[model samples]
Target: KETAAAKFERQHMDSSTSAASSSNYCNQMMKSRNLTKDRCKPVNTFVHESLADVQAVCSQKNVACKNGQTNCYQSYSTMSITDCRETGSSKYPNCAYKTTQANKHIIVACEGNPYVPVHFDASV
Candidate 1:
């Protein structure tokens, strides 16, 4: 079984040009990462929520759906999009409040694309 990180790398690093191919690669990656097929559901939900916030930062209305394992896309900034999923279990209520350096802020360039960054109340 391929781990999620490995599947993620294969899809992104390989020259595969199709969404389905990328999805297959991502599934393999998820398997490698010890992510069960059923567990993928919550991961997708997490991806959607986070991507929504990211889209909000650009003042664009968008939705993210599971594209494979941990990959997601927003319509406005698909090229610069990123996805994330939870890795640890908890006895606590909000895993989101558990902080990590992974959430350190960075701006993704939509490149020469027509997207603009809007001011989100950064204190959230």
Candidate 2:
């Protein structure tokens, strides 16, 4: 059983890829990271920053979650990230993605006793 915090780390964290050069980044990563197991994740963003920096976002500006929940927070500084959007022609078991990298302030939903990110809401 994966905890929310662990799931977030698995799906969104990528401290090693500080910058993306290859267009196939998402195509390779989305599958390798197991995001393409049952079906393609329509859209996701992988933060290319340190875990400590990303965790600090929970203590930054508070914001409303995309679902209108009050447990979200927005980062104060722009961070490196790679966006993975499923390609139109992609199908299950053969998922393909369009990868794009950018520096943006991220918004995430946090929870639990220790209080850490659970869901990646968006980037701006």
Candidate 3:
């Protein structure tokens, strides 16, 4: 029998972010009706916008939308995980849940200035 991890690896391990990139997950979450107009942009915008959030622990001066190097995609200690509940939107339905995972968690291999980790409770 295949372990869950094994199954996940076989089915999803090779999946890259670009695989689901076409789904417009962020657009559905930050639409004009849901959030301010400025809230809706490309995933890169979503990342850059997070820099201003004190909770995300990112500096605007250090983060940008450059390639996977020297930008939001490369910055450590600035990424976040947002769990979104469906609220009966036009583009999507309530049965679907969205989890936006970005590249900002401070990996030991990509170390820089360190910051305390952020924990979240979805029940709250």
Candidate 4:
């Protein structure tokens, strides 16, 4: 069974590619990462940094979560990331996405004993 941390890495971490070279990145990654199960994940962000660096964000500045949780934190430094957004005409089984790369301070929701990232909130 895949743990939450492991799953997070699979779904959101992509240190191999610092920037998305092709628009098909999201279309392929979203499906390969299992975010396109029953329904397409409308939007998702992949961090292009070391796992340790990303996990360290848990100890950065605390912030309010989008869902009102207080466990959210913001990254101190700008990170390389790719934003994947489903295209308007995207439909089930044929999920289409727009790939955008940017350097931004990311916001993520953390949890558990080690207090690691559980959800990607947004990029700021």
Best by TM-score: 2
Candidate 4 ranges with C-alpha deviation above 4 Å: none
Q: For residues 15-79, could you state the per-residue lDDT of candidate 1 as single tens digits? A: 22212223243334344444453444223211212333444444443323233321222334323
Off by over 4 Å in 1: 1-18, 22-26, 37-58, 62-74, 77-124
- Alpha-carbon local distance difference test for all models: 0.30, 0.93, 0.31, 0.92
TM-score of each model, in listed order: 0.21, 0.97, 0.23, 0.93
Superior candidate under TM-score, 2 versus 3: 2
- Candidates 1 and 3 compared by lDDT, better number: 3
lDDT minimum window of 10 residues, candidate 4: 2-11
Best by lDDT: 2
lDDT of 3 by residue, 1-124 (tens): 8543232222222222322253455444455223424332222222222222422333423333323333232233444333333334523322333445544432111113443212111111
Candidate 3 pairs with clashing backbones: none
User: What TM-score does structure 3 among the candidates reach?
Assistant: 0.23
For every candidate in turn, the CA RMSD to the true structure comes to: 14.1, 0.8, 14.3, 1.2
Local distance difference test, candidate 3 = 0.31
Provide backbone clash counts, one per model: 7, 0, 0, 0
Model 3 Cα RMSD, Å? 14.3
